[PDB]
Design a protein that fits this description.
The structure is cut from a larger assembly and holds eleven copies of chain A.
Chain A: H1 2-26, H2 29-52
The complex binds adenosine-5'-diphosphate.
PDB class: lipid binding protein
Keywords: escrt-III, Membrane remodelling, nucleotide hydrolysis, photosynthesis, thylakoid biogenesis, stress response, lipid binding protein
Entry title: Structural basis for VIPP1 oligomerization and maintenance of thylakoid membrane integrity
Chain lengths: ~55, ~55, ~55, ~55, ~55, ~55, ~55, ~50, ~55, ~55, ~55
C-alpha cells in the first residue's frame, strides 16, 4: 500500500514541477509559486512514505 | 412586520403547492382553448358593430 | 362616421388578437413535440446508459 | 411588510449563496484557471503548427 | 423596562424564525406579484382620470 | 456521518435486492418497447410541426 | 386645463413606477437562475469533495 | 398557464443530456463549410469538361 | 470528560460496525449514482442561466 | 434487413448520381449541385449500413 | 471497453484536426482555433485511455 501511494506522489510531483515552468513562461509569478507549493506538498508526503516503507 | 412576513411566506408556499400539484400542460392547452373561444365571441361582437354600421 | 371609426379600431384589435393566438398555437405544439423529444432522449440515456437491469 | 424589502432580503440571500459557492469551490480545490491556461498555451502552439503546414 | 426588553427579544426570535422559513425562489417571485397587483390598481385610477378629462 | 453511511449501506443493499429479484431480460425487452413507443409519438409530433409549417 | 395638468402628473408617475416594477421583474428571473446555480454548485462541491464521511 | 413557463419546463427537461449550446453551434459550422466547400468546386470544373 | 470519551468510544464502535456492513460492489456503484444525481441538478441550473441570457 | 437498407439507399443514390451526371454534362451547375448533395447524403447513410452489416 | 473508448477518441481528434485545417484554409481562423481546442481535449482524453489500456 505505502509503495503504491509513494510511487504515485512522485509522479504527481512531476506534473506540478513541469507546470511551474509553463506558468513563468505565461508571465505569472502568482500561479508559478502556487504550482511550486503544490509540488512541495507531494514531495514532502513522498519523503515521509519512503521512510515509512 | 411579523405577520406581514408570515403572510408572504404562506402565500409563496401555497402558490408553489398549487403549481406542483397542477399539471401545466393541461392548463396551457386549456388557456389556448379559452383564448380561441374569446376570439370567436369577439368576431361575433365585431359582426354586430358591422351590422349596426350597415 | 363615429360608429365606423370606432368599429375600425375594434376591427384592428380583432386582427391583433387573432395573430397572437395563431402564434401561441404554433408555439404550443412545437413545445409538446420538443418535450416528447426530451422524454424519448431520456429513455435512450437509460437503455444505452450505465449499468443496471 | 413591503414587497420591495422582501425582494431586497432575498436578493441579498441569493448573493450570499453565490459567495458561499465561490468560497466552497476554493476550499474544495479550485483548479480551472489552471487547466484553462494550459489548454490555451497548448492550442496556441497547435494553431502555429497547423498554420505552418 | 425588563418587560419591554423581553418583548424585544421575543419579537427578534420570531422575526428570525419567519426569516428562516423564507425560500428565495417562491418569495422573490411573490414580491413581484404584489408589485404587479398594486400597479393594476393605480392604472385603473389613471383610467378614470383620463375618462373625466374627455 | 454514522447515519449518512447507514443510508449508503441501506440504498446499496436495496438496489442489489431489487436487481436480484428482477429479471433483466424482460426489463431490457420492455425498454426497447418503450423506446419504440416514444419514437412513434415523436414521429406524430414532428408531423404536426410539418403540418404547421405547411 | 386643470384636468389636463393633474392627469399629466399621474402619467409621469405611472411611467416611473412601471419602469421600477419592470426592473424588479427582469431581476427576479436572473436571480432565480442564480439561486439555482449556487445551490447546485454547493451540493456538488461537498459530494465530490473528499472532506466528510 | 403561460407559454414562457411551458418553454422553461421543456428547456430544463433537455438539460438531461447537455445543451450548453456550444454543441449544435460549433457542429453545424463545420458541416455547412466542408459540404459546400467541395460541392461547388468539383461541379464547376466538371461541367466545362463534359461539354 | 469521561462522558465525552465514552461517547467517542461508542461512536467509533458504531462507525466500525457500519464500515464492516459495506460491500464494495454495491457501495462503489452507489457512490457513482450519487455523483450523477447531483450533476443532473447542476446542469438544470446552467440550463436556466443559458435561457435567461437568450 | 441490414443488407436491404444498404441496397435501398444505394439504389436511390444511383438515381441522384445519374441526375447529377446529366446535369454536369449539360453544364447546369445548380441542378448538379442539388443532385450531388442528395447522392452524398444517401451514400453516407449507406456507408453506415455497410459498417453495421 | 477501454480499447474501444481509446480508438473512438483518437478518431474524433483526427476529425477535429481536419476540421481545424479546413476552417483555417477557408479563412475562418477563430473557428479553427476552437477546433484545435476540441482536438487537444480529445487527444488528452485518448492519452489517458491509452495508459489505462
Ligand atoms: N452505475 C451507473 N452508471 C451510470 N448511470 C447509472 C448507473 N446506475 C444507474 N444509472 C442511471 O443512469 C443515469 C446516469 O446519470 P447521467 O447524469 O445521465 O450520466 P452522465 O452524467 O454521464 O451524463 C442516472 O440518472 C441513473 O439513474
Amino acid at each position: 500500500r505505502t509503495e503504491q501511494r509513494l510511487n504515485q506522489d512522485t509522479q504527481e510531483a512531476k506534473k506540478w514541477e513541469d507546470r511551474a515552468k509553463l506558468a513563468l513562461t505565461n508571465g505569472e509569478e502568482n500561479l508559478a509559486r502556487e504550482a511550486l507549493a503544490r509540488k512541495k506538498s507531494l514531495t514532502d508526503t513522498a519523503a515521509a512514505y519512503q521512510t515509512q516503507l | 412586520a411579523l405577520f406581514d412576513r408570515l403572510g408572504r411566506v404562506v402565500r409563496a408556499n401555497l402558490n408553489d403547492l398549487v403549481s406542483k400539484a397542477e399539471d401545466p400542460e393541461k392548463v396551457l392547452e386549456q388557456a389556448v382553448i379559452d383564448m380561441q373561444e374569446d376570439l370567436v365571441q369577439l368576431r361575433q361582437a365585431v359582426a354586430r358593430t358591422i351590422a349596426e354600421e350597415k | 362616421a363615429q360608429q365606423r371609426t370606432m368599429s375600425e379600431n375594434l376591427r384592428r384589435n380583432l386582427a391583433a388578437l387573432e395573430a397572437k393566438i395563431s402564434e401561441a398555437k404554433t408555439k404550443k405544439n412545437m413545445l409538446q413535440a420538443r418535450a416528447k423529444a426530451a422524454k424519448a432522449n431520456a429513455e435512450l440515456q437509460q437503455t444505452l446508459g450505465g449499468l443496471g437491469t | 411588510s413591503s414587497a420591495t424589502s422582501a425582494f431586497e432580503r432575498m436578493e441579498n440571500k441569493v448573493l450570499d449563496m453565490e459567495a458561499t459557492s465561490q468560497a466552497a469551490g476554493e476550499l474544495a480545490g479550485f483548479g480551472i484557471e489552471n487547466q484553462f491556461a494550459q489548454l490555451e498555451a497548448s492550442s496556441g502552439v497547435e494553431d502555429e503548427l497547423a498554420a505552418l503546414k
